Design a protein around this ligand. Structure first.
Ligand SMILES: Cc1[nH]c(C(=O)Nc2nc3c(O[C@@H](C)c4ccccc4)cc(C(=O)O)cc3s2)c(Cl)c1Cl
Length: 185
């Protein structure tokens, strides 16, 4: 039901004009990585503001499940990204593009979406000794009247999450000003 999200984004992500809803897009992805840390699976989260104005969030948790979901006939990861915290499916719906990478059970999986529509089924692209999830997303300029992330707004929330989740190392990178901050209680 991502149609409803695109039609009334304010109801799902908050104010699309004043910067709050825009930064909520990053916070929703980070909150999924924090849940992975609370469960004891993740101890490092890297949040990057890219030169292209996109944001990536990488965790070293379990990685989103990749096995086919019986009811849906597609990867569990696709079901989580494409069917309605508000959930990462809201971030996907309101992103012109989203790139998902999963490191799980010795394999690297990827899927790309445009406005929440998968471009191809989740595919294995290589081998890895690591586990975790990376989401890179480009917020839709059709939804958000401002799409430029403020490193100070992200920094304040990441500092809070670092404090509240001691033992998670949170790295904030802003490629636009070559900034890196490490939050580790
Ligand atoms: C940056 C980032 N990281 C994650 C992330 O790691 N999420 C993971 N979710 C699971 C998991 O629950 C799935 C089936 C589920 C997700 C939402 C609601 C209900 C169910 C199950 C398992 C498992 O059984 O191994 C592992 C994971 S890891 C997300 Cl989402 C985002 Cl965004």
């Amino acid at each position: 039901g991502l149609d409803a999200v695109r039609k009334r984004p304010g109801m799902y992500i908050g104010d699309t004009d004043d910067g709050t809803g825009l930064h909520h897009m990053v916070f929703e992805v980070v909150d999924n990585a924090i849940d992975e840390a609370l469960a004891g699976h993740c101890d490092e989260i890297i949040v990057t503001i890219h030169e292209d104005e996109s944001v990536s969030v990488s965790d070293n948790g379990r990685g989103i499940p990749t096995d086919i979901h019986p009811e849906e006939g597609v990867s569990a990861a696709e079901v989580i990204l494409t069917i309605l915290g508000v959930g990462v499916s809201v971030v996907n719906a309101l992103s012109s593009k989203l790139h998902l990478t999963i490191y799980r059970a010795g394999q690297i999986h990827e899927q790309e979406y445009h406005h929440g529509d998968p471009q191809y089924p989740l595919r294995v692209i290589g081998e890895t000794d690591n586990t975790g999830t990376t989401v890179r997303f480009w917020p839709s300029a059709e939804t958000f009247s401002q799409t430029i992330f403020n490193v100070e707004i992200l920094a304040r929330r990441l500092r809070e999450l670092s404090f509240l989740n001691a033992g998670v190392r949170i790295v904030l990178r802003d490629e636009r000003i070559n900034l890196e901050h490490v939050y580790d209680y």
